[PDB]
Amino acid sequence: HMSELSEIDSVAGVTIYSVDGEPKSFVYKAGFAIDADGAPNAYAPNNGGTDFTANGGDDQGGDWWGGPVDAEGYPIKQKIFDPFPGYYVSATAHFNPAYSEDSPYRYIDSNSIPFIVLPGNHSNGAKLGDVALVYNEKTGDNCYAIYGDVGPSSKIGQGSVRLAQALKIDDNPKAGGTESRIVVTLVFPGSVGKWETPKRWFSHANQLTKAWGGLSRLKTLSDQL
Ligand SMILES: N[C@@H]1[C@@H](O)[C@H](O[C@@H]2O[C@H](CO)[C@@H](O[C@@H]3O[C@H](CO)[C@@H](O)[C@H](O)[C@H]3N)[C@H](O)[C@H]2N)[C@@H](CO)O[C@H]1O
Protein backbone atom coordinates (compact mmCIF):
# COMPACT_ATOMS: atom_id res chain seq x y z
CA HIS A 1 0.00 0.00 0.00
CA MET A 2 0.84 3.60 -0.59
CA SER A 3 1.52 5.73 2.48
CA GLU A 4 -0.20 8.93 3.66
CA LEU A 5 2.19 11.89 3.42
CA SER A 6 2.04 15.37 4.95
CA GLU A 7 4.40 18.15 3.89
CA ILE A 8 6.61 19.50 6.67
CA ASP A 9 9.44 21.30 4.85
CA SER A 10 10.95 22.16 1.48
CA VAL A 11 14.61 22.68 0.52
CA ALA A 12 15.99 23.38 -2.97
CA GLY A 13 12.80 22.22 -4.67
CA VAL A 14 12.68 18.95 -2.69
CA THR A 15 9.56 18.41 -0.59
CA ILE A 16 10.06 16.77 2.82
CA TYR A 17 7.05 14.79 4.04
CA SER A 18 6.07 13.40 7.39
CA VAL A 19 4.90 9.82 6.87
CA ASP A 20 1.59 9.54 8.70
CA GLY A 21 1.57 6.75 11.26
CA GLU A 22 4.04 5.14 13.64
CA PRO A 23 6.92 4.99 14.21
CA LYS A 24 7.45 8.68 13.48
CA SER A 25 9.37 9.28 10.25
CA PHE A 26 9.95 11.75 7.44
CA VAL A 27 10.95 11.13 3.84
CA TYR A 28 12.38 12.94 0.82
CA LYS A 29 13.55 12.03 -2.68
CA ALA A 30 16.68 13.88 -3.76
CA GLY A 31 20.04 13.63 -5.47
CA PHE A 32 23.08 12.40 -3.62
CA ALA A 33 26.25 14.45 -3.31
CA ILE A 34 29.31 12.95 -1.62
CA ASP A 35 30.31 14.19 1.85
CA ALA A 36 33.83 12.91 2.51
CA ASP A 37 34.11 14.86 5.76
CA GLY A 38 35.20 12.64 8.61
CA ALA A 39 37.27 10.43 6.31
CA PRO A 40 40.88 10.61 7.57
CA ASN A 41 42.19 10.76 3.97
CA ALA A 42 39.77 13.44 2.70
CA TYR A 43 42.08 16.44 3.09
CA ALA A 44 45.84 16.96 3.05
CA PRO A 45 48.31 19.69 2.02
CA ASN A 46 48.79 20.29 -1.70
CA ASN A 47 45.66 18.40 -2.76
CA GLY A 48 47.01 15.16 -1.29
CA GLY A 49 43.59 13.99 -0.08
CA THR A 50 40.70 12.22 -1.76
CA ASP A 51 38.98 15.63 -1.97
CA PHE A 52 40.56 18.81 -3.28
CA THR A 53 41.95 20.68 -0.30
CA ALA A 54 39.95 23.83 -1.06
CA ASN A 55 36.67 21.94 -0.60
CA GLY A 56 37.45 22.21 3.11
CA GLY A 57 38.27 25.92 2.93
CA ASP A 58 41.62 27.69 3.09
CA ASP A 59 44.38 25.64 4.72
CA GLN A 60 46.84 28.54 5.10
CA GLY A 61 45.22 30.31 8.06
CA GLY A 62 41.98 31.47 6.44
CA ASP A 63 38.45 30.15 6.83
CA TRP A 64 38.75 26.36 7.16
CA TRP A 65 35.60 24.32 7.77
CA GLY A 66 36.93 20.86 6.91
CA GLY A 67 38.05 20.12 10.46
CA PRO A 68 39.65 21.51 13.63
CA VAL A 69 42.42 24.10 13.57
CA ASP A 70 45.40 24.96 15.75
CA ALA A 71 45.95 28.18 17.72
CA GLU A 72 47.14 29.93 14.53
CA GLY A 73 44.20 28.80 12.40
CA TYR A 74 45.93 26.03 10.38
CA PRO A 75 44.28 22.60 10.08
CA ILE A 76 45.31 20.04 12.68
CA LYS A 77 47.58 17.39 11.17
CA GLN A 78 47.19 13.73 12.04
CA LYS A 79 49.80 12.09 14.28
CA ILE A 80 51.72 8.81 13.97
CA PHE A 81 48.88 7.02 15.83
CA ASP A 82 46.18 8.41 13.50
CA PRO A 83 45.06 6.68 10.28
CA PHE A 84 46.80 9.05 7.81
CA PRO A 85 49.76 10.81 9.45
CA GLY A 86 50.28 14.29 8.05
CA TYR A 87 46.82 14.55 6.51
CA TYR A 88 44.40 17.01 8.02
CA VAL A 89 41.86 15.96 10.64
CA SER A 90 38.46 16.15 8.93
CA ALA A 91 35.39 16.67 11.10
CA THR A 92 31.68 15.83 11.01
CA ALA A 93 28.94 17.46 13.06
CA HIS A 94 28.20 14.12 14.73
CA PHE A 95 31.01 12.95 16.99
CA ASN A 96 32.13 10.37 19.53
CA PRO A 97 32.90 12.14 22.85
CA ALA A 98 35.40 9.41 23.82
CA TYR A 99 38.01 11.23 21.70
CA SER A 100 39.50 14.71 21.76
CA GLU A 101 38.61 17.52 19.34
CA ASP A 102 41.95 17.16 17.53
CA SER A 103 41.51 13.39 16.93
CA PRO A 104 40.24 11.84 13.67
CA TYR A 105 38.71 9.12 15.86
CA ARG A 106 36.25 11.66 17.28
CA TYR A 107 34.52 12.03 13.91
CA ILE A 108 32.43 9.72 11.71
CA ASP A 109 34.66 8.08 9.11
CA SER A 110 32.85 8.71 5.82
CA ASN A 111 34.84 5.88 4.20
CA SER A 112 33.44 3.26 6.60
CA ILE A 113 30.15 4.51 8.07
CA PRO A 114 26.92 4.96 6.06
CA PHE A 115 25.69 8.42 7.02
CA ILE A 116 23.33 11.06 5.65
CA VAL A 117 23.63 14.83 5.72
CA LEU A 118 20.68 17.03 6.58
CA PRO A 119 20.62 20.76 5.70
CA GLY A 120 21.35 23.19 8.49
CA ASN A 121 18.10 24.59 9.93
CA HIS A 122 16.20 21.69 8.30
CA SER A 123 16.71 18.76 10.66
CA ASN A 124 12.91 18.47 11.06
CA GLY A 125 13.20 17.07 14.56
CA ALA A 126 16.11 14.70 13.88
CA LYS A 127 19.13 14.79 16.17
CA LEU A 128 22.65 13.74 15.20
CA GLY A 129 23.01 9.97 15.58
CA ASP A 130 19.37 9.25 14.67
CA VAL A 131 18.92 6.45 12.15
CA ALA A 132 17.50 6.31 8.63
CA LEU A 133 16.74 3.88 5.81
CA VAL A 134 18.13 4.96 2.43
CA TYR A 135 17.00 3.51 -0.92
CA ASN A 136 18.21 3.98 -4.52
CA GLU A 137 15.22 3.56 -6.84
CA LYS A 138 17.47 3.07 -9.89
CA THR A 139 19.65 0.29 -8.52
CA GLY A 140 17.31 -1.30 -5.95
CA ASP A 141 20.01 -0.95 -3.30
CA ASN A 142 19.42 0.12 0.30
CA CYS A 143 21.31 0.78 3.49
CA TYR A 144 20.68 1.87 7.05
CA ALA A 145 22.48 5.08 7.98
CA ILE A 146 22.86 7.69 10.70
CA TYR A 147 22.31 11.42 10.54
CA GLY A 148 26.02 12.20 10.72
CA ASP A 149 26.73 15.65 9.30
CA VAL A 150 25.11 19.03 8.62
CA GLY A 151 25.17 20.70 5.22
CA PRO A 152 24.31 24.11 3.77
CA SER A 153 20.78 25.24 4.54
CA SER A 154 20.06 25.70 0.81
CA LYS A 155 21.03 22.19 -0.35
CA ILE A 156 19.62 18.73 0.26
CA GLY A 157 20.61 15.18 -0.66
CA GLN A 158 24.09 14.15 0.42
CA GLY A 159 25.79 11.35 2.30
CA SER A 160 28.97 9.47 3.03
CA VAL A 161 31.42 7.65 0.76
CA ARG A 162 30.36 4.31 2.25
CA LEU A 163 26.66 5.11 1.82
CA ALA A 164 27.34 5.87 -1.85
CA GLN A 165 29.05 2.48 -2.20
CA ALA A 166 26.09 0.71 -0.57
CA LEU A 167 23.66 2.49 -2.94
CA LYS A 168 25.83 1.87 -6.06
CA ILE A 169 26.42 5.59 -6.63
CA ASP A 170 29.88 6.76 -7.71
CA ASP A 171 31.67 7.34 -4.39
CA ASN A 172 34.51 9.60 -5.60
CA PRO A 173 34.56 12.86 -3.59
CA LYS A 174 35.79 14.80 -6.65
CA ALA A 175 33.49 13.62 -9.44
CA GLY A 176 31.05 11.17 -7.83
CA GLY A 177 27.52 11.49 -6.56
CA THR A 178 24.52 12.21 -8.72
CA GLU A 179 22.24 15.14 -9.45
CA SER A 180 19.43 12.78 -10.46
CA ARG A 181 16.74 12.61 -7.77
CA ILE A 182 16.97 8.85 -7.31
CA VAL A 183 17.63 8.47 -3.57
CA VAL A 184 14.77 8.13 -1.10
CA THR A 185 15.76 8.86 2.51
CA LEU A 186 13.46 7.81 5.37
CA VAL A 187 14.58 9.41 8.65
CA PHE A 188 13.43 8.25 12.10
CA PRO A 189 13.65 11.44 14.21
CA GLY A 190 14.05 10.84 17.92
CA SER A 191 15.37 7.32 17.35
CA VAL A 192 18.86 7.56 18.94
CA GLY A 193 20.12 11.11 19.41
CA LYS A 194 23.60 10.16 20.64
CA TRP A 195 26.77 8.41 19.54
CA GLU A 196 26.73 4.63 19.81
CA THR A 197 28.53 1.75 18.13
CA PRO A 198 27.51 1.08 14.51
CA LYS A 199 26.37 -2.43 15.45
CA ARG A 200 23.93 -0.93 17.96
CA TRP A 201 22.47 1.82 15.78
CA PHE A 202 22.25 -0.51 12.79
CA SER A 203 20.26 -3.00 14.88
CA HIS A 204 17.99 -0.16 16.02
CA ALA A 205 17.45 0.99 12.43
CA ASN A 206 16.56 -2.61 11.55
CA GLN A 207 14.02 -2.82 14.38
CA LEU A 208 12.36 0.49 13.46
CA THR A 209 12.29 -0.45 9.78
CA LYS A 210 10.58 -3.77 10.57
CA ALA A 211 8.01 -2.01 12.74
CA TRP A 212 7.41 0.62 10.04
CA GLY A 213 6.71 -2.00 7.34
CA GLY A 214 10.08 -2.70 5.76
CA LEU A 215 11.69 -1.89 2.46
CA SER A 216 8.59 -3.10 0.61
CA ARG A 217 6.63 -0.17 2.04
CA LEU A 218 9.36 2.36 1.24
CA LYS A 219 9.58 1.05 -2.34
CA THR A 220 5.86 1.66 -2.90
CA LEU A 221 6.10 5.03 -1.15
CA SER A 222 8.98 6.08 -3.41
CA ASP A 223 6.64 6.02 -6.42
CA GLN A 224 4.59 8.83 -4.81
CA LEU A 225 7.61 11.16 -4.51
N1 LIG B 1 32.16 21.64 2.92
C1 LIG B 1 31.00 22.44 3.46
C2 LIG B 1 30.88 22.30 4.94
O1 LIG B 1 30.18 23.47 5.46
C3 LIG B 1 30.15 21.07 5.41
O2 LIG B 1 31.00 20.44 6.36
C4 LIG B 1 30.38 20.33 7.65
O3 LIG B 1 29.81 21.62 8.14
C5 LIG B 1 29.22 21.46 9.47
C6 LIG B 1 28.64 22.77 9.91
O4 LIG B 1 27.69 22.54 10.91
C7 LIG B 1 30.25 20.96 10.49
O5 LIG B 1 29.55 20.76 11.72
C8 LIG B 1 30.32 21.23 12.84
O6 LIG B 1 31.30 20.18 13.26
C9 LIG B 1 32.05 20.50 14.49
C10 LIG B 1 32.81 19.27 14.92
O7 LIG B 1 31.97 18.26 15.43
C11 LIG B 1 31.15 20.98 15.64
O8 LIG B 1 31.99 21.51 16.67
C12 LIG B 1 30.16 22.02 15.20
O9 LIG B 1 29.21 22.20 16.28
C13 LIG B 1 29.40 21.63 13.98
N2 LIG B 1 28.52 22.76 13.55
C14 LIG B 1 30.92 19.69 10.03
O10 LIG B 1 32.06 19.40 10.88
C15 LIG B 1 31.41 19.77 8.63
N3 LIG B 1 31.83 18.42 8.13
C16 LIG B 1 29.87 20.08 4.27
C17 LIG B 1 29.12 18.88 4.73
O11 LIG B 1 28.82 18.10 3.60
O12 LIG B 1 29.13 20.73 3.17
C18 LIG B 1 29.70 22.07 2.77
O13 LIG B 1 28.81 23.03 3.12
Residue numbers in the entry: 0 to 224
Quote the study on this structure.
Co-crystallization of both mutant proteins with chitohexaose (a β-(1-4)-linked polymer of six D-glucosamine (GlcN) residues) gave a complex with the E157Q mutant only. The substrate was located in the interdomain cleft, with three of the six GlcN residues (hereinafter named GlcN-1, GlcN-2 and GlcN-3) visible in Fo-Fc electron density, oriented such that GlcN-1 is the reducing end. The GlcN-2 and GlcN-3 residues are in a standard chair conformation, however, the density for the first observed residue (GlcN-1) suggested a distorted boat conformation. The GlcN-1 residue is anchored by a single hydrogen bond between the O6 atom and the side chain of Q157. The central GlcN residue (GlcN-2) makes hydrogen bonding interactions with the side chains of D148 and D36 via its free amine, along with a third to the backbone carbonyl oxygen of A90 from Domain-2. The GlcN-3 residue makes a hydrogen bonding interaction with the carbonyl oxygen of T91 via the O6 atom, and another to a water molecule. Although some additional Fo-Fc density was observed at the non-reducing end of GlcN-3 (the O4 atom), the sparsity of the density did not allow for a fourth GlcN to be modelled. The location of the trisaccharide fragment and the interactions it makes with the protein suggests that residues D36 and D148 form the −2 subsite and play a key role in binding and orienting the substrate (in this case via the GlcN-2 residue). The E157 residue represents the −1 subsite and may serve as the nucleophilic group responsible for bond cleavage, assuming that hydrolysis occurred at the reducing end of GlcN-1. A loop in V-Csn Domain-2 (residues Ala90 and Thr91) is involved in formation of the −2 and −3 subsites and would be expected to correctly orient this end of the chitosan substrate for optimal positioning of the −1/+1 cleavage site.
